[PDB]
Ligand binder design. Structure first.
Ligand code: NA
Length: 361
C-alpha cells in the first residue's frame, strides 16, 4: 500500500509503538494503518489517509490507537470520523491551532517526571506516578457530578481532571518509562450509596504479569471514606479490582451502535504487590488474633491512622460486624498506645475491603 510507512521513519515508529497494548490485538493491515496514524498525528495532520478495510476493522484500528496514545491529547475524546473515497479512507481528528506547542509542553513535563523518579524499580516508579498524579491534579468533582477534562492536557497543564485524564496520564508516564501499560475503560461501582458510573483505569506489567491500577479512585476528593493517599487501588489482582470495576471489551463507536466483545483485557492474578501485603496489613483469613496483631505491629511502628485490607468479602464483613458489636478487644489495644484515649473512629472502603482507624476526639 502507498500509505504504509517506509525507510528509517518506519523503523522509528515500529520501535515507538512496540509496547502499546491494543496495538498487539490488531491484524497486519490494521497495524499498518496504526503506524500511518502515528506518523501523521506526530506531524500534526488533521486528516490521515489510510488503506481501505472493513468499517469494523477501521473502527478497531482507530479505537485501539486512541486508547493507546495519550500523547496526541487532541484525539483522546474525539469522535471517530472517516470517509471512504477512491481507494482511500480519510480519517479526520479536528486539531487545535496550538497543538504542536502544547504537545511539546506535555513531552517536557512527562520527560521531567520520568527522568527524576527517585528509584528505577518498576514498582516504585508505578507507585511514584500514582502519587504524582493524585498529588498534583485536582479531581474535577463538579464535572463528574454533572470534554476538556478527558486528556493528559487537563492533568499536566490544567491540573484539573476526571478519571479518563488520570488514567491516560498514568499510561503516558508508564510508556515514557518503558513499562508495559494499558488503558482500560468500563463501569465503576461504588457503595454507601450503591452507584454505577462510566469509568477508566489501568493495568501495568511488572515481572511479566499484570497488575490493576486506579489512580483516580485513590484520590481523596474522588473518595474520602478512609480519610491523604489511598494506596488500596495500587497494583491489585482482579479478585479485588472486580469488586468495584467491570472492564468493557466493547467498542461504542457512536451513540447508537457498538461492536461487542472485541478486546482482550489484562488478566491480573498476583497479590504480591498489594500495599497492604507489603506493609503487613493484609488479612487473608478472618482471625481476631491476627487482626489485633497486625494493628499492634502498626502501633508499635507508631503509625496513625492504622489500616487493614482483607482478601475476601465475608472476612471483611465479619470484621465490620465485630466492630458494631465486640469492640472491647480494640479499645484494650488502642488504649495502650494512644494517650488520653477516649475511643476510636473508623472509615470503611468496602470497594477494596479496606478499613482505617484513628483516635477519637
Ligand atoms: Na488530587
Amino acid at each position: 500500500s502507498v500509505f504504509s510507512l517506509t525507510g528509517k521513519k518506519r523503523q522509528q515508529i515500529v520501535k515507538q509503538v512496540r509496547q502499546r497494548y491494543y496495538f498487539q490485538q490488531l491484524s497486519k493491515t490494521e497495524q499498518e494503518n496504526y503506524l500511518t496514524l502515528y506518523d501523521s498525528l506526530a506531524q500534526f495532520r488533521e486528516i490521515i489517509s489510510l488503506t481501505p478495510a472493513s468499517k469494523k476493522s477501521l473502527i478497531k484500528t482507530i479505537d485501539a490507537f486512541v486508547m493507546d496514545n495519550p500523547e496526541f491529547y487532541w484525539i483522546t475524546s474525539a469522535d471517530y470520523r472517516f470517509e471512504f473515497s477512491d481507494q482511500t479512507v480519510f480519517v479526520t481528528f479536528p486539531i487545535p491551532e496550538d497543538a504542536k506547542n502544547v504537545y511539546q509542553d506535555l513531552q517536557a513535563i512527562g520527560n521531567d517526571i520520568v527522568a527524576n523518579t527517585p528509584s528505577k524499580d518498576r514498582y516504585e516508579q508505578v507507585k511514584y506516578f500514582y502519587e504524582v498524579i493524585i498529588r498534583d491534579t485536582d479531581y474535577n468533582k463538579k464535572a463528574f457530578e454533572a470534554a476538556s477534562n478527558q486528556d493528559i492536557k487537563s492533568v499536566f497543564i490544567d491540573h484539573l481532571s476526571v478519571c479518563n485524564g488520570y488514567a491516560q496520564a498514568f499510561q503516558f508516564l508508564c510508556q515514557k518509562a518503558g513499562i508495559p501499560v494499558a488503558y482500560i475503560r468500563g463501569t465503576g461501582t461504588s457503595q454507601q450509596p450503591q452507584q454505577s458510573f462510566a469509568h477508566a483505569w489501568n493495568a501495568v506489567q511488572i515481572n511479566n504479569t499484570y497488575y490493576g491500577v486506579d489512580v483516580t479512585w485513590g484520590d481523596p476528593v474522588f473518595d474520602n471514606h478512609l480519610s491523604t493517599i489511598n494506596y488500596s487501588f495500587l497494583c491489585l489482582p482482579d479478585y479485588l479490582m472486580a469488586l468495584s470495576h467491570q472492564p468493557s471489551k466493547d467498542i461504542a463507536f457512536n451513540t447508537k451502535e457498538r461492536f461487542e466483545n472485541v478486546w482482550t483485557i489484562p488478566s491480573c492474578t498476583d497479590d504480591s504487590l498489594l500495599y497492604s501485603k507489603r506493609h503487613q496489613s493484609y488479612i487473608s483469613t478472618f482471625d481476631s488474633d491476627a487482626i489485633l496483631a497486625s494493628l499492634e505491629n502498626q502501633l508499635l511502628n507508631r503509625q496513625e491512622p492504622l489500616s487493614l485490607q482483607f482478601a475476601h468479602q465475608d472476612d471483611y464483613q465479619q470484621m465490620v460486624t465485630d466492630l458494631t458489636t465486640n469492640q472491647t478487644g480494640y479499645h484494650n489495644l488502642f488504649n495502650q498506645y494512644w494517650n488520653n484515649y477516649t475511643g476510636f473512629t473508623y472509615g470503611l472502603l468496602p470497594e477494596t475491603l479496606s478499613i482505617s482507624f484513628a483516635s477519637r476526639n
